[PDB]
A paper describes a structure:
Transcription activator RamA is linked to multidrug resistance of Klebsiella pneumoniae through controlling genes that encode efflux pumps (acrA) and porin‐regulating antisense RNA (micF). RamA acts as a class I activator on acrA and class II activator on micF, respectively. AraC family proteins are highly conserved small proteins that contain two helix‐turn‐helix (HTH) motifs and bind to a degenerate consensus sequence called marbox with considerable overlap in the genes they control. In order to provide the molecular and structural basis for RamA's roles in activating transcription, cryo electron microscopy (cryoEM) single‐particle reconstruction was used to study the structures of RamA‐RNAP‐σ 70 ‐acrAB (class I activator)/micF (class II activator) promoter complex.
Numbering used by the authors: 378 to 456
The structure:
DNA sequence: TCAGGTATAGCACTGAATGACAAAACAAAATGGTCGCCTGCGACTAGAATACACTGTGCTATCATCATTAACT
């Protein structure tokens, strides 16, 4: 239920990060994976909004995916 | 023309030269110890919710294959 509710937030972040990269579908899948990984560790005791945490996790996932994938040769994240 | 002789070659003989085996030393190569960098993984808590991809081949020249429309039976 949380994933189905936040799919719209995921696609909104994807639209805010509209780069060609590999493909929009791969970026949406990476955002969904990041959303799931954030939900698996999220709690409401902080008294803040889940939107910021989910956005940070999706940004990290997209950065890792564009640093590793979306290229012929594999380039590390530090490079 | 026959013969003494000097030039040239074979023969008797100890002792120095030349073979075979083993050991010590140096250089080339593979294996192992060690240092610093590359890299794989996790976390950062104000709010951010289908609008950003975007289109552009252009309507050539016909030719043949598949379900819906209309109507004869």
């Amino acid at each position: 239920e949380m994933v189905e509710a936040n799919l719209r937030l995921v696609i909104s972040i994807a639209k805010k990060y509209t780069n060609r990269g590999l493909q929009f579908l791969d970026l949406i899948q990476e955002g969904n994976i990041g959303l799931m990984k954030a939900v698996d560790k999220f709690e409401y005791r902080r008294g803040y909004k889940f939107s910021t945490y989910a956005t940070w996790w999706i940004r990290q996932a997209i950065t890792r995916s564009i640093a590793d994938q979306a290229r012929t040769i594999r380039i590390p994240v530090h490079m």
